[PDB]
């Protein structure tokens, strides 16, 4: 495949929920993850190159595989432990799945992580969409 590179930015926030009883003295926290695309100047723009995003959460969660179809694909959950996870992003026009490793952790109140992905140029609608975020 001919491909182009794009940087996506994963944004995470978390805060303690004091009304939830701590579990084994560990507080329960509310947390969220969203995903934006960066353009070639570094500005956040809606990640419309993805048809859907699936968060593959730690197996302790009820229904750990959460599907979203509208940018910024925001997920909200509660828990008491950090964990690694994979985020599946599905490019437009069945152009392919990319697995993006993330770590959900409580080290900061909010933090951002950038990932470069390679996107094919063989689906006209996706190719047109990619022109919004940089050269193709």
């Amino acid at each position: 495949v001919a491909t182009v590179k794009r940087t996506i930015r994963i944004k995470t926030q978390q805060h303690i929920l004091p009304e939830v009883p701590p579990v084994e003295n560990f507080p329960v926290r509310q947390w969220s993850i969203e995903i934006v695309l960066l353009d070639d100047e570094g500005k956040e723009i809606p990640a419309t190159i993805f048809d859907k995003v699936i968060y593959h959460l730690h197996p302790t969660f009820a229904n750990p595989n959460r599907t979203f179809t509208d940018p910024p694909f925001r997920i909200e959950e509660q828990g008491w432990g950090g964990f690694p996870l994979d985020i599946s992003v599905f490019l437009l026009e069945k152009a392919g799945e990319r697995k993006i490793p993330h770590d959900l952790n409580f080290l900061q109140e909010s933090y951002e992580v950038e990932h470069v992905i390679q996107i094919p140029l063989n689906k006209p609608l996706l190719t047109e969409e990619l022109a919004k975020s940089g050269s193709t």
Binding site: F26, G79, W80, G81, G82, F83, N105, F106, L107, Q108
Partner: peptide, 5 residues
Amino acid sequence: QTARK
């Protein structure tokens, strides 16, 4: 803040 599962 270092809590892991």
